[PDB]
């Protein structure tokens, strides 16, 4: 049979061994029979990639100039995986994604089909209760969830598998009462140990109404993630990532104290050093007493602590916690200016929910995580469904009913929902300015013709 399901999409199949040619041919045929724009094949086993820098420029020149939408691979063991997956945000999906997507006649979510064996929560649809957490806690839990391949939802549904809460006192528990209520150690365990949560340990992580005292929570945390030896030791082998670096941790990161211990152990197990700053510290003397401090880690770009810090140490690296975890995924220390806009201390909110309640289409996998992060730090909301509650539709291209409906509603002078591309979101944040989404550059819905227009490149 045939269809237009994959219309205007470019694919790249990585063949890891000659025995996989029949399934490579069988997948190209499904993609062509359903009207894909282009499907390149690349044989990993038939080229020497030793001592050639398979970097971002190498990849764009070798397989562009237009975007690749999906890389099809049943392994992540190839030397441009990190460039594809963490920088360019191109999904990497198994052969089965093509089969299932054809059978269901829809572009399925990429997460369950990732072959990264670290993506231990690829199945989970996770609600994180904002009422339960500070901003900086929420951002860290989302970072690690995304790094574990899970999906973040901002609504409870039948699809939802997990609800992350801090304590029985949290108001989300009561007002609700299938899916399971757990403490954030459910996330952190998978991250630290890289194996599923199955023992009696798995029982500790579930919401327990007897835990009305702080002393009990502290005690489950020290048990579940306190004390070590982990699985899949080969997956992040650079145990000196932060050697000769020393991080000053801002007091505007008011973490649950065991959560700070986790971040300190993560840093220190990667051979870095950590000093916590407090609000009453004299900063000149802290930095003079610890002159090897070369990085500041903070939540807000407008912290007074960060202003005085820059004055004392004007060459300090200035990052956020997200920045640490991105260095973790690249497995290389990397200056903030070479990372992404989301790896800086956050700007003050630009928009309100009322100005900015956006919906989006054709963004898979990490690009999805990225629009969501961007909307958050811009001050708005994002929804999975397009309704009339929405102020904008963000789009890359012109396909999908979602675009057609929203492009129709934008012709009405009363409605006035706006259709714009993602660079409006990005340039707004970078310039810290409410730019105009009907500008020429933000009406370009042919971004796929160039890979440099991939969401997340602006600010690099």
């Amino acid at each position: 049979s045939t269809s237009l399901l994959f219309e205007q999409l470019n694919f790249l199949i990585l063949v890891a061994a000659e025995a996989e040619l029949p399934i490579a041919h069988s997948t190209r045929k499904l993609l062509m029979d359903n009207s894909c724009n282009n499907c390149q094949i690349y044989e990993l086993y038939n080229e020497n990639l030793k001592d050639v820098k398979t970097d971002k420029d190498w990849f764009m020149n070798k397989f562009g100039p237009q975007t690749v939408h999906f890389v099809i691979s049943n392994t992540i063991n190839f030397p441009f995986y990190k460039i594809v997956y963490f920088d360019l945000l191109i999904p990497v999906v198994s052969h089965t994604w093509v089969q299932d997507s054809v059978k269901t006649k829809r572009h399925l979510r990429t997460n369950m089909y990732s072959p990264n064996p670290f993506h231990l929560l690829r199945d989970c649809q996770v609600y994180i209760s904002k009422s339960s957490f500070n901003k900086c806690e929420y951002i860290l839990y989302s970072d690690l969830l995304h790094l574990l391949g899970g999906t973040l939802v901002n609504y409870i549904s039948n699809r939802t598998t997990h609800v992350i809460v801090q304590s029985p006192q949290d108001p989300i528990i009561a007002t609700v009462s299938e899916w399971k209520f757990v403490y954030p150690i459910w996330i952190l365990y998978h991250f630290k140990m890289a194996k599923p949560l199955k023992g009696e340990l798995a029982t500790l992580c579930e919401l327990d109404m007897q835990d009305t005292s702080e002393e009990q929570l502290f005690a489950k945390w020290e048990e579940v993630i306190g004390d070590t030896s982990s699985s899949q030791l080969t997956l992040h082998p650079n145990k000196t990532l932060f050697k000769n670096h020393h991080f000053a941790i801002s007091p505007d990161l008011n973490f649950f104290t065991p959560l700070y211990w986790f971040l300190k152990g993560f840093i220190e197990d990667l051979d870095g050093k950590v000093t916590p700053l407090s609000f009453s510290d004299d900063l000149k003397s802290v930095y003079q007493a610890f002159p090897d401090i070369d990085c500041y880690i903070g939540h807000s770009a407008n912290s007074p602590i960060l202003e005085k810090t820059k004055s004392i140490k004007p060459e300090i690296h200035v990052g956020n916690v997200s920045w640490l975890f991105y260095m973790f995924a690249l497995q290389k220390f990397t200056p903030v200016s070479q990372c992404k806009l989301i790896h800086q201390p956050f700007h003050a909110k630009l928009f309100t929910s009322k100005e900015l309640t956006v919906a989006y289409t054709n963004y898979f996998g990490s690009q999805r995580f990225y629009i969501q992060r961007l909307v958050e730090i811009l001050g708005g909301l994002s929804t999975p469904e397009l309704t009339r509650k929405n102020t904008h539709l963000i789009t890359k291209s012109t396909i999908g009913k979602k675009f057609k409906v929203a492009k129709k509603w934008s012709l009405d002078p009363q409605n006035a929902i706006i259709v714009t591309n993602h660079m409006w979101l990005e340039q707004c944040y970078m310039n810290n300015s409410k730019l105009n989404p009907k500008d020429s550059r933000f009406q370009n819905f042919k971004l796929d013709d160039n890979m440099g227009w991939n969401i997340g490149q602006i600010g690099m």
């Binding site: 957490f133 901002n154 409870i156 549904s157 108001p171 909301l381 469904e385 309704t387």
Partner: peptide, 22 residues
């Protein structure tokens, strides 16, 4: 009305929208 994801919510996003340090 509602155009689905294409890749149904009961408790909406705007209800529990605040962080405990807002």
């Amino acid at each position: 009305e509602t155009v689905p994801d294409s890749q149904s919510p009961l408790i909406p996003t705007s209800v529990g929208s605040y962080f405990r340090d807002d």
